Amino acid sequence: MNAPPAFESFLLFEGEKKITINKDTKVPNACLFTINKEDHTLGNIIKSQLLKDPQVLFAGYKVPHPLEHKIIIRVQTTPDYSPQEAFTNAITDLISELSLLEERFRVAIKDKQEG
Amino acid sequence: QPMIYICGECHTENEIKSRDPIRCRECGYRIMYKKRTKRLVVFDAR
Amino acid sequence: PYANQPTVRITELTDENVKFIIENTDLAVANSIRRVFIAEVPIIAIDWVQIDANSSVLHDEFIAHRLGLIPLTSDDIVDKLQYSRDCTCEEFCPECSVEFTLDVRCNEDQTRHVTSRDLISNSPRVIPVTSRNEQDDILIVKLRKGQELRLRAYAKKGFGKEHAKWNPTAGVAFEYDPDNALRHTVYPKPEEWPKSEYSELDEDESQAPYDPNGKPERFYYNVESCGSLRPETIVLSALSGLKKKLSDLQTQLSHEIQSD
Amino acid sequence: MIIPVRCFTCGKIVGNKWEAYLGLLQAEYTEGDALDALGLKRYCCRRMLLAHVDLIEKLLNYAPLEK
Amino acid sequence: IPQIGDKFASRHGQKGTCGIQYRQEDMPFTCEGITPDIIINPHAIPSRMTIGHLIECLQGKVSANKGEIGDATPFNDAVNVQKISNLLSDYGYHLRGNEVLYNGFTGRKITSQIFIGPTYYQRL
Ligand SMILES: [Zn+2]
Numbered sequence: 001m002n003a004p005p006a007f008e009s010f011l012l013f014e015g016e017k018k019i020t021i022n023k024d025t026k027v028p029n030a031c032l033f034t035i036n037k038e039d040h041t042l043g044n045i046i047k048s049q050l051l052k053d054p055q056v057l058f059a060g061y062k063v064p065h066p067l068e069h070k071i072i073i074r075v076q077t078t079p080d081y082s083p084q085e086a087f088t089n090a091i092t093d094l095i096s097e098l099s100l101l102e103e104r105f106r107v108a109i110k111d112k113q114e115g
Numbered sequence: 116q117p118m119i120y121i122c123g124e125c126h127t128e129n130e131i132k133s134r135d136p137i138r139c140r141e142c143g144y145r146i147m148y149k150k151r152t153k154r155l156v157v158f159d160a161r
Numbered sequence: 162p163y164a165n166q167p168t169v170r171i172t173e174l175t176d177e178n179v180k181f182i183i184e185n186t187d188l189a190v191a192n193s194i195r196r197v198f199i200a201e202v203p204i205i206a207i208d209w210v211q212i213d214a215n216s217s218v219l220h221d222e223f224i225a226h227r228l229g230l231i232p233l234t235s236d237d238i239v240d241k242l243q244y245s246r247d248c249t250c251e252e253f254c255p256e257c258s259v260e261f262t263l264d265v266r267c268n269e270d271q272t273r274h275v276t277s278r279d280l281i282s283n284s285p286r287v288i289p290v291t292s293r294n295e296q297d298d299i300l301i302v303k304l305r306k307g308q309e310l311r312l313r314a315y316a317k318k319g320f321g322k323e324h325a326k327w328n329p330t331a332g333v334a335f336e337y338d339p340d341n342a343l344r345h346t347v348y349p350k351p352e353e354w355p356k357s358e359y360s361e362l363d364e365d366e367s368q369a370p371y372d373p374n375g376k377p378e379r380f381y382y383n384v385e386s387c388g389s390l391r392p393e394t395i396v397l398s399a400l401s402g403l404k405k406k407l408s409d410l411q412t413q414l415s416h417e418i419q420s421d
Numbered sequence: 422m423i424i425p426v427r428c429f430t431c432g433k434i435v436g437n438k439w440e441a442y443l444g445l446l447q448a449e450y451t452e453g454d455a456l457d458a459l460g461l462k463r464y465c466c467r468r469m470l471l472a473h474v475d476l477i478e479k480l481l482n483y484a485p486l487e488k
Numbered sequence: 489i490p491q492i493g494d495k496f497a498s499r500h501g502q503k504g505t506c507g508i509q510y511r512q513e514d515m516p517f518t519c520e521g522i523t524p525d526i527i528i529n530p531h532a533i534p535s536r537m538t539i540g541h542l543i544e545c546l547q548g549k550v551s552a553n554k555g556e557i558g559d560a561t562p563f564n565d566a567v568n569v570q571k572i573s574n575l576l577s578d579y580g581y582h583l584r585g586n587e588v589l590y591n592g593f594t595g596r597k598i599t600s601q602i603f604i605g606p607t608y609y610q611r612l
């Protein structure tokens with residue numbers, strides 16, 4: 001009667017942007033990234049990778065409503081740095097980490113099956 | 116057009132037209148069931 | 162400001178589960194990997210049923226739901242098939258779906274067990290796991306003499322976010338800091354609690370001394386497979402899926418940055 | 422009415438274990454040992470097999486609608 | 489199919505509607521990846537004093553781990569909480585039915601060890 005289709009958690013609606021960047025006016029060098037059709041899976045890793053950047057002053061995320069299917073990630077960096085650049089570098093670092101983890105898991109599987 | 120029904124007691128496929136008392140021709144039982152439609156109903160296995 | 166250099170150590174690899182350890186990674190990465198095991202590792206499962214005849218004691222949606230939860234071998238085919246969203250065909254085609262047929266009739270006096278062995282596929286690679294060449298076959302329905310079940314299913318590509326039938330795991334044990342050194346738990350009576358299988362403590366010692374400078378490292382995993390994928394295929398597909406989620410996010414990020 | 426396919430909690434397949442479970446029980450296994458023989462180690466799957474009531478066997482005592 | 493707003497009840501007067509449904513990766517999990525089918529609020533216990541709910545949960549954990557059916561007949565001196573706890577401690581569990589759970593969203597351990605186990609629920 002009121003059950004949303006299960007794909008609405010993963011699929012973007014037509015004309016709906018995957019990610020939107022909005023300047024935070026309260027403090028300088030801060031941005032809000034509203035990412036649609038993602039959840040804690042990417043939010044937590046992006047936040048925790050951003051916390052590894054010493055040029056990042058704030059890194060947090062929230063799912064504003066569990067029934068809704070977006071996350072907001074707030075990133076504040078030092079003045080010489082940018083929150084967009086920080087977010088990009090965090091994603092790049094996560095991708096490199098996962099590539100290395102995948103190659104090493106392939107090697108470990110090969111060793112385990114062989115000996 | 117035929118509207119074949121099944122008997123509740125003898126399970127016999129028998130045709131009955133409108134304005135006809137509901138009686139199985141094989142055993143006279145008074146309760147009949149319609150057969151499953153031929154239309155194509157789809158289920159999402161969820 | 163840069164990526165981790167995680168290492169891996171697989172401590173057990175069977176056809177049923179994989180038990181491994183990831184070290185030198187963040188807890189968020191470990192838990193996102195754990196979540197992707199459950200919710201973003203695609204597999205093949207029946208997601209469309211057409212009941213041509215069902216004289217069984219279970220109604221049509223019961224049979225359909227029951228067929229959807231039968232695991233189908235998805236190892237090499239799931240990467241090749243497309244989502245029906247992405248397929249440029251009609252409702253179905255062999256590029257985005259797999260056809261199954263089931264046609265059973267109980268004529269004999271003993272009860273006929275309509276099992277997953279009766280799910281006949283057009284694709285030899287995508288078959289019910291129990292039907293793969295021990296464990297018995299999954300029971301779809303029991304039929305009495307004169308009862309009959311004839312249906313036509315189509316299996317699709319999906320993951321556990323959409324429905325648990327596309328979840329490839331039969332349990333994902335995840336653990337870290339087996340000895341409570343980070344004190345992320347606070348036992349009122351630490352002596353009362355059993356020791357983890359990964360604990361390295363003498364029996365007199367209940368929990369490790371508190372580590373003020375500690376961070377969660379060395380996450381232990383036991384990924385049990387429902388049958389569709391091999392456990393190591395579940396882990397590899399999870400890592401690839403998480404990496405493609407991040408890559409797509411970065412692509413959209415670049416479009417948003419350059420459009421500003 | 423019939424043995425579920427998956428364990429509600431973890432999603433382990435239990436549909437193929439009901440008949441084997443009954444065969445082990447008539448083989449003079451205890452329910453715990455039978456559940457151990459089938460590889461149900463989490464108490465959720467043990468719940469699934471141990472608390473199941475096979476009502477379909479009673480529904481098959483009624484003649485079908487068509488012969 | 490059960491949904492938000494459907495009424496469920498245990499056998500102890502503990503009724504309530506489904507507030508929300510989380511997927512298995514969003515629910516909290518034990519070290520062996522068991523997620524709860526249902527999560528009920530601890531504040532429903534103290535005023536109500538439905539200790540039978542807790543004893544049934546603990547007895548049910550013992551029953552599921554032992555392969556038996558628990559005897560909850562009302563006035564039975566051969567079955568008390570200490571015996572059930574001693575039985576549960578033999579299966580590698582905290583004797584009082586608590587377990588370390590992990591946050592499904594972040595994977596971090598929950599500081600307070602949660603009371604979890606099989607309980608018979610009813611859909612109304
Ligand atoms: Zn008749």
Ligand SMILES: [Zn+2]
Pocket residue numbers: 245248249250251252253254255256257258
């Ligand atoms: Zn197609």
Ligand SMILES: [Zn+2]
Pocket residue numbers: 428429430431432433463465466467
């Ligand atoms: Zn289970």
